[PDB]
Amino acid sequence: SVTADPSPPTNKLNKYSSRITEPKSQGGSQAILHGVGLSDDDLLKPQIGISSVWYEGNTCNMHLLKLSEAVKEGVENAGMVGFRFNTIGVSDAISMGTRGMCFSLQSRDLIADSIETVMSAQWYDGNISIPGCDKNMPGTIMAMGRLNRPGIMVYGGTIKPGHFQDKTYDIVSAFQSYGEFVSGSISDEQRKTVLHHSCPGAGACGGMYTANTMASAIEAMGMSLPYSSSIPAEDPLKLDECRLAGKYLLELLKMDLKPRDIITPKSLRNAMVSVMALGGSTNAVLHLIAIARSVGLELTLDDFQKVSDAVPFLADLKPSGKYVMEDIHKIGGTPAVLRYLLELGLMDGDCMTVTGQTLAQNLENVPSLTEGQEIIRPLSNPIKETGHIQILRGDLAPDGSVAKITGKEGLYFSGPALVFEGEESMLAAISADPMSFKGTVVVIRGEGPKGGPGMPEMLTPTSAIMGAGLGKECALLTDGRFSGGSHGFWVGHICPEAQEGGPIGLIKNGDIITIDIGKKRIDTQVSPEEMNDRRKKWTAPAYKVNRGVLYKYIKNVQSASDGCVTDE
Amino acid sequence: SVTADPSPPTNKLNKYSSRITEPKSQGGSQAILHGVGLSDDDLLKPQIGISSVWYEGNTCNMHLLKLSEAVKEGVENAGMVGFRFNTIGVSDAISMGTRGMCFSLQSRDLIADSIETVMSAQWYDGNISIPGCDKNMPGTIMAMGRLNRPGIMVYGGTIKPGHFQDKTYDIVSAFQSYGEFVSGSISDEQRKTVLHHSCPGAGACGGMYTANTMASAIEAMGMSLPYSSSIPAEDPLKLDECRLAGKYLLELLKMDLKPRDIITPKSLRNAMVSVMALGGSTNAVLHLIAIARSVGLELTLDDFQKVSDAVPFLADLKPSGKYVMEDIHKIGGTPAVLRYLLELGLMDGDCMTVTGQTLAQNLENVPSLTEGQEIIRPLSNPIKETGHIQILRGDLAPDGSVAKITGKEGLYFSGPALVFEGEESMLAAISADPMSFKGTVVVIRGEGPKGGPGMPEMLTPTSAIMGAGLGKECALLTDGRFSGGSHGFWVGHICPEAQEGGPIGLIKNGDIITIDIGKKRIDTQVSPEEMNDRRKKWTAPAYKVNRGVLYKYIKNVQSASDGCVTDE
Ligand code: FES
Ligand code: FES
Ligand SMILES: [Mg+2]
Ligand SMILES: [Mg+2]
């Protein structure tokens, strides 16, 4: 029983805004509303909060004001009042590699707080959110779940791949350019050319990374309109979707079809099914748990393992494959993918969606995957018989951990631990003495929600390992997160994190660590009694901040196995 | 020693953005920056985060996107790169009277978190903030203090008074209209006419309420440019100020004149001096404490009492007087007011400001208060010999409380307590049985930062008291806040709040409460031993929420005497 936001004061379409538009005792409210341009007749209409995440310093978000204007126009075209407002967001592509990354994950929870705040204070009847980026998307859904007022999330759209001189690039090309330069693979001028053509325009990062994972998952959950996740950012049809969201939201107000009517155990499973089938990001574990909690439901790591075991990986999409979200768009979009998964019996078609109809009804007449397409494998010949996402426990991750397992890595890794108290000291060690890493289980700890602080996503450690030729010769463990595609036994989200005294914070250099994918365990040769000896002598490190938004995060955040929720 | 945000990697103007624009290892960052439109030459420039609080559902904020575009143009005209982003805010005029008010105060702290987040993640060198409303203003300064990067706050400007048929209105006219209708003073049609003409356009609420108090105080603190606080929202000179902020910020980057160089004990006192001289809001106590903490300084309730005792109330401004901020603008603006206070020896002129010069240097050549003006009283004939703001302690507010004391109320009030566990039950009681309030000390408790939750500002209780003719016949105590002008012994901010087991939560109906302004005490006839007896049997009420942004507020917020900071 979630208690968060104001209740409305049955067939009324302005259930909330009537609190301030109708009583004479709210004459001050009505005076403001006339001052912002509402007529007496406008005061009778539903009021839609239109929350975008526009900002100019990221390609994923710089276009969203234009989208928000189209959403407002369509809300007015549907007989409603549209009130635009706008939250913050941050760019992982900009902050990756820097301590700015400590601020990224928590911006999800701040976006949720932001939209909840405005919708509650202004008494809006419904919400249309326009995220464009990584964390923006689940933050908007969490606010929707807390408020439980009719809402639709309009994905801003993925960016198109960059093209120059018969070469094709994305943000990962730009990430990888430094290492290829240092290795001698490319010249400084080729490096510079990659940076000028990797990000050609607006839109979220282009492969099946976190943004496309979550947009697809949220469409599969029924909380975006069909095709929202797969229409590209700069596409004319994205603007048309914006101009239609008001029509759809009107119908949701008439039926009073709310987020907790749409986000259910079965539609959460539908979202998880799309993550497994498409090879989506391990970050979806954090965000789908957070979304489930926001509507008062439960979702555990073991629920992810069960769906992973039930759903084959079918999609030849970056990072693990070759294609990108624009290629999905060209062969029928996300609805064509979900139609195939539904036909295979992998999804529950009875779930209500923001179209006002069920998932099966949305998908009944959509064009199917284009004949001859090579992106989505048939069930008979999947890329992997089960999903990439694997939950591991064992001695060193007793409360869980998350890995992306392709099947190319083998079933076991065993090696002496090489332990670093953060990303910076690992990178200096691999720079000075790369051969000391050969055969080791590398542990980068102190990078969890409280220890980091902020659970930063880390990319430099793994590109340093790949560039040293050590990809098949070591394993990587962290209480933080690893960015992009895996190329080995790379395990993140290890719980309890080191800052909390979890076993990962008790590992010492030379401890033999064995990762067993089949048993789903990360174990240590150190005896349980010696581990307990170390725990008795362990003292928590001082927090790295004492003020500001990150210290509030330290005070509030739950574990990664609990989705790093902050409001419980 | 504040530890919150990233440090820069001496004469460089791009101290922070060089972290991502210069190293080859940040090629991903640079690819994004080219995609958003930066040239190779642009990468060399400082990057300014331009944070507005635009949203369409409030007159105070609906214009701020236009202002933000002018700020960006001036940043580019100054040889810098401008990156706009935008936070949330909420409208007290809309939410007043409703549980939406529970979300208002905390939006200050969420704005602070929001701007801190973006500036840290994106590595911006400086900040220009464009608030328009109540809580927006101190939230932007708190972010500035945490980051300690050069910053300027551009006030959006006050709204102009409304005019219709030789009558003049503001938001308070609209608030008061319901009660005048119920009393028979005005007809329904006159009531409706007030609502259509009370708020004529963009801008913050027009008298010396919280917005104008804090804009004036922040200008007096040196963190806005001269006249920022007094130029009206729709004025051409406000746009010109926006287009100049970049020139001024460039110079701050050259001198590296930072917020903790500008916000000092002496400039905090300067801000407090302006609050006392102008009759500013008791809310300035919360916000100036929060601003002081954000730069690692201390500011106590007793510091406010000392300044109040030292500074006469001089300004004939609403709520207590007749004039409004536009009238100040017409007689020389905030700089003319501060020039007079400086000439009187009430302020410290050596404080550095965002002009790159001292306060005395800014004021040396500004036009003085217009000859003949009747708004600012001479020191010889003040409206009150000391400031309105009074700190009270005593048995029932051992950790402090705040009142606005005009001098019209007498020095003492004594009466039996009439106790309500929230605003709703008080209002029902005064509706049913108004005479039962005559002679009482009314206690509205459970309205503090944790109890409310959110320390709501309350207006309906006091207009109900005025409308029942009880203004001179009772006193009002709360652990929350009272809105607008006082018309009696109306004390808010009582600490500890009732939810925390403070004495206010132990008062029983009939307890004789005596308010003594001269002794600065709110005392009870109940013996200390009986109070302690009650405390031993007291149990905290359940919190009113268990999820969402308000439950996080309950988890994080300090007392009103500590400025309701949330990050400590
Ligand atoms: S930084 Fe926005 S999705 Fe990658
Ligand atoms: S609601 Fe914005 S200052 Fe009054
Ligand atoms: Mg990312
Ligand atoms: Mg207010």
Residue A376 lies in a domain: no
Nearest CA to ligand 1 atom 2: A133
Amino acid at B553: Y
Same domain? A359 vs A411? no
Residue that terminates a domain, selected from A179, A197, A215? A197
Which residue in chain A has the smallest CA separation from B543?
Answer: A3
Q: Do both B283 and B253 map to the same domain?
A: yes
**Total residue count of chain B as it appears in this document:** 568
Q: Are residues A307 and A188 in the same domain?
A: no
In a domain, B408, yes or no: yes
Domain end, chosen from B348, B363, B378, is at B363
* Cβ(B53)–Cβ(B132) below 8 Å: yes
User: CA nearest A21: which of A38, A6, A5?
Assistant: A38
CB contact under 8 A, A194 and B460: no
- Same domain for B496 and B521: yes
Q: Which whole-number Å values give the CA distances from B218 to A551, B214, B306, in the listed order?
A: 26, 6, 19
Reduce the DSSP state of residue A257 to 3 states and report it: coil
Closest CA–CA distance from residue B425 to any residue of chain A (Å): 17
CA distance to A47, A335, A541, per residue, from A149 (Å): 12, 25, 42
> Does residue A396 contact residue A521 with C-beta atoms inside 8 Å?
no
- Determine whether the annotation assigns residue A205 to a binding site: yes
CB A144 within 8 A of CB A259: yes
Distance of CA B192 to the CA centre of its chain: 30
**CB contact (8 A) between residue B32 and residue A118:** no
Q: Considering the domain boundaries, does residue A417 fall inside one?
A: yes
The C-alpha angle A223, A227, A231, rounded to 5 degrees, equals 125
Ligand 3 centroid to residue A214 C-alpha, Å: 11
* Cis preceding linkage at A265, omega within 30: no
- Are B134 and B211 spatial neighbours (Cβ–Cβ below 8 Å)? yes
| Data resolution in angstroms | 1.8
Residue that terminates a domain, selected from B311, B345, B363: B363
Residues of B in contact with A103 (CB under 8 A): 117, 120-121
Strand, coil or helix: A507: coil
CA-CA-CA-CA torsion sign (A467, A472, A473, A478)? positive
Mutation choice for A interface testing from B3, B32, B99, B116 by most A CBs within 10 A: B32
Buried b (16+ CB within 10 A) or exposed e, B228-260: bbbbbbbbeebbebbbbbbebbbebbeeebbbb
Residue B211 CA to ligand 2 center (angstroms) comes to 7
Out of B90, B93, B178, whose CB is closest to A25? B178
Chain B positions in Cβ-Cβ contact with residue A49 (cut-off 8 Å) = 57
Give yes or no: residues A232 and A346 share one domain: yes
- Judged by its nearest atom, the ligand closest to the C-alpha of residue A282 is 3
Ligand 1 within 6 A of A288 CB? no
Residue A3 lies in a domain: no
Which ligand 1 atom lies nearest to the CA of residue A132?
Answer: 2
Q: Do A3 and B547 touch (CB under 8 A)?
A: yes
- Give Cα B149 distance to the centre of its chain: 22
Q: Do A146 and B55 touch (CB under 8 A)?
A: no
Residues 6 or more apart whose CB falls under 8 angstroms from that of A490 comprise: A403, A404, A462, A475, A476, A482
Contact B417, B493 (CB under 8 A): no
Statement to judge: residues B422 and B334 lie in one domain: no
Question: What number of helices (H) and strands (E) belong to chain A?
Answer: 21, 16
A135 and A209 housed in the same domain: yes
How far is the C-alpha of A443 from the C-alpha of A462, rounded, in Å? 12
Joined together, the tokens standing for residue A535 give 């725990």
Angle at A412 between CA A409 and CA A413, to 5 degrees: 90
Q: The tokens of B536 are what? A: 């031993």
Query: Residues B333, B420: one domain?
Result: no
CATH code of the domain containing A274: 3.40.50.2300
- Catalytic residue, from B483, B486, B559, B561: name it: B483
Q: Please state, in angstroms and rounded to a whole number, the distance separating the CA atoms of residues A400 and A383.
A: 26
The verdict on a CB contact (< 8 Å) between B94 and A32 is: yes
Residue of A nearest to B23 (CA): A178
Distance CA A255, CA B563 (A): 44
Provide, as residue numbers in chain B, all residues whose Cβ is less than 8 Å from the Cβ of A463: none
Indicate yes or no: CB of A171 within 8 angstroms of CB of B550.
no
The answer to whether position A30 is within a domain reads no
| Per-residue exposure over A514-529, b if at least 16 CB sit within 10 Å of its own CB, e if not | bbebeebbbbbebeee
Chain A residues near residue B171 by CB distance under 8 angstroms = 28, 31-32
Assign A561 to helix, strand or coil.
Answer: helix
Phi first, then psi: give them for residue B37, nearest 5 degrees.
120, 5
**Is residue A235 marked as binding?**
no
Chain B interface test: which of A84, A115, A547, A566 (most B C-beta within 10 Å): A547
Ligand 1 pocket test, pick from A56, A60, A318 with the greatest ligand atom count within 8 Å of Cβ, gives: A60
Asked if A4 and B550 come within 8 Å (Cβ–Cβ), the reply is yes
C-alpha dihedral, A68 to A70 to A71 to A73, nearest 10°: 120
DSSP letter, residue A504:
G
Alpha carbon of B92 to ligand 2 centroid (Å): 6
> Which site among B34, B40, B47, B56 would you substitute to test the A interface, given the most A Cβ atoms closer than 10 Å to its Cβ?
B56
The residue length of chain A stands at 568
* CB A49 within 8 Å of CB A85: yes
- Using the mean position of ligand 3's atoms as its centre, give its distance from the Cα of residue B26 in Å: 15
Overall domain count for chain A: 3
Angle, to 10 degrees, between the axis of helix B283-294 and the axis of helix B265-278? 170
In sequence order, the 6+-apart residues with CB closer than 8 A to the CB of A13 are A45, A46, A125, A250, A253, A254
Shortest CA gap B370–chain A (Å): 32
* Ligand 2 atom closest to residue B134's alpha carbon, by position in its atom list: 3
DSSP state of A232: -
The helix (H) or strand (E) run that includes residue B420 is: strand B412-420
Among A17, A29, A92, the residue to mutate for chain B (most B Cβ within 10 A): A29
Contact B121 A95 (CB under 8 A): yes
Q: Which atom of ligand 1 is nearest to the CA of B32?
A: 1
What CATH code is carried by the domain that includes residue A548? 3.50.30.80
Ligand with an atom nearest the CA of residue A121: 2
**Is the bond preceding residue A236 a cis peptide, omega within 30 degrees?**
no
Q: How far is C-alpha B172 from the geometric centre of its chain's CA atoms?
A: 17
How far is the C-alpha of A156 from the C-alpha of A176, rounded, in Å? Answer: 26
Residue B267 zone, left/alpha/beta (φ > 0; ψ -120 to 50; rest): alpha
Strands B126-130 and B151-153 turn out to be parallel
Task: Please report the number of interchain residue pairs, chain A to chain B, with beta-carbon separation below 8 angstroms.
Answer: 335
Atom 2 of ligand 2, nearest CA residue:
B133
A326 is in an annotated binding site: no
What Cα–Cα distance (Å) separates residue A69 from each residue in A25, A164, B271? 33, 32, 40
Asked if the bond preceding B496 is cis, omega within 30° of 0, the reply is yes
Is the C-beta atom of A133 inside 6 A of ligand 1? yes
Ligand nearest, relative to CA of residue B484 = 4
CA distance A273 to A349: 12
Put simply, the answer to whether B28 touches A123 (Cβ < 8 Å) is no
Does B205 appear as a known binding residue? Answer: yes
Nearest-atom number in ligand 2 for the CA of B61 is: 2
Q: Which residues line ligand 2 (CB under 6 A)?
A: B 58, 60, 91-93, 133-134, 204-205, 211
Distance from CA of A553 to the nearest CA of B (A): 9
Q: Are residues B239 and B304 in the same domain?
A: yes
Chain A residue with Cα closest to B55 = A85
Same domain, B211 and B252: yes
Copy the structure tokens of residue B254.
């050259």
A130 and A154 in contact (C-beta within 8 Å)?
yes
Ligand 4 centroid, distance to B411 Cα (angstroms): 28
Q: Is residue A534 in a domain?
A: yes
A410: closest CA of chain B, how far (Å): 31
Annotated catalytic sites of A, by residue? 483
In sequence order, the 6+-apart residues with CB closer than 8 A to the CB of B74 are B242, B243, B244, B245, B246, B247
Evaluate the omega torsion of the peptide bond into residue A453 and state whether it is cis, within 30 degrees of 0.
yes
Q: Is residue A85 part of a domain?
A: yes
What the block records as the tokens of B206 is 């027009």
Residue A87 dihedral angles phi and psi, to the nearest 5°: -100, 180
State whether A453 and A534 are in the same domain.
yes
- A302 and A408 part of one domain: no
Cβ contact, residue pair A93, B29, below 8 Å: yes
Give a yes or no: residue B374 inside a domain.
no
Range of the domain at B179: 163-197
Closest CA to B547 of A138, A141, A1, A223: A1
CA distance A303 to chain B (A): 23
Q: Which residue, A485, A409, A451, A433, is CA-closest to A559?
A: A451
List chain A residues with CB under 8 Å of B83: 55-57
Paired strand residues for B514: B414, B523
